[model samples]
Target: GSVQIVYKPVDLSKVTSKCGSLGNIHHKPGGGQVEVKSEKLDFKDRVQSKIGSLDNITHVPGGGNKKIETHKLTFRE
Candidate 1:
């Protein structure tokens, strides 16, 4: 089994300021943006734990093929 990963860069310049009745209109200077980062890799473990290993099966493949893949997500504050 193997895993692959891909990451896409974020664009922060497109961000715009909003004004509403909740607050007064104001302009603030900013530099580094607040970014969100997250990682998703535990989903399989939790599922296997819930299923338990009470009942198990073993297969000796006469003719076999195998494959695997990965997921993506990130958030930081």
Candidate 2:
């Protein structure tokens, strides 16, 4: 013997948005939504001199060397 069944439930929505608008609906299909500006990195020159004497330089979605351990710091005269 064999048998099968199907079921579905819960469907709700009418109209609701204001004050801080965004009642949800963009479901993506292109057009209008993209801005992560201020992305500039074309580093060289010894990684731009270790990003100005490094301080654990971080991720720009993206490095170098300068200074000595003691009494020494140089990147070409």
Candidate 3:
């Protein structure tokens, strides 16, 4: 089974400014960019956790003459 996961990348510059020495200890930024590819598996869990939902199933359909379907999932911040 496969899943489509999405997320945003964290900007070190922004993070540093927000939480380096000025922001509250628990002050966290929200939203930046999404990282896909090798991190897809973990990304799925992150999204589910953020929204408090469980994944049911993920399906990828096979194409004609192709034993398995190949997909490219991408993300950006």
Candidate 4:
């Protein structure tokens, strides 16, 4: 018999980030993380359209957690 194993889930802090006018939207790595990021896509697109905007305070283990979310994000315009 044979078996295998794998380890994933990059420590949230390990994820790199891209700073924006709002804040750093951490570019989720390939895998479940990306999927999670997309979940916000639908909502943010709507918010950014007509006062539909968005802001994300991602895992900043390097600092304190001032990160947050929204209900007025604009969608693809």
lDDT winner: 1
**Model 3 stretches with alpha carbons more than 4 Å out:** 1-50, 64-77
| Candidate 3 lDDT, 4-73, residue by residue in tens | 6765555443212122243323434454555444434446433544433333343322322323334565
TM-score of 1: 0.20
lDDT of 4 by residue, 1-77 (tens): 65444545444544355544455566654433322223343564336443433445455454433544344534452
Error of 3 at 1 (Å): 59
Point out the worst 10-residue segment of candidate 4 by lDDT: 31-40
Clashes of 2: 0
**Selected candidate, larger TM-score, 1 vs 3:** 1
Error of 1 at 13 (Å): 36
Q: Report clashes for each candidate as comma-separated counts.
A: 7, 0, 6, 20
Models 1 onward score TM values of: 0.20, 0.18, 0.15, 0.15
Candidate 2 per-residue lDDT, tens place, 41-60, comes to 67656653323331333332
Number of the predicted model whose TM-score against the real structure is largest: 1
Higher-TM-score candidate among 2 and 3?
2
Q: lDDT of all the models against the reference? A: 0.47, 0.40, 0.41, 0.45
Q: What's the distance in Å from true for residue 74, model 3?
A: 24
TM value for model 3: 0.15
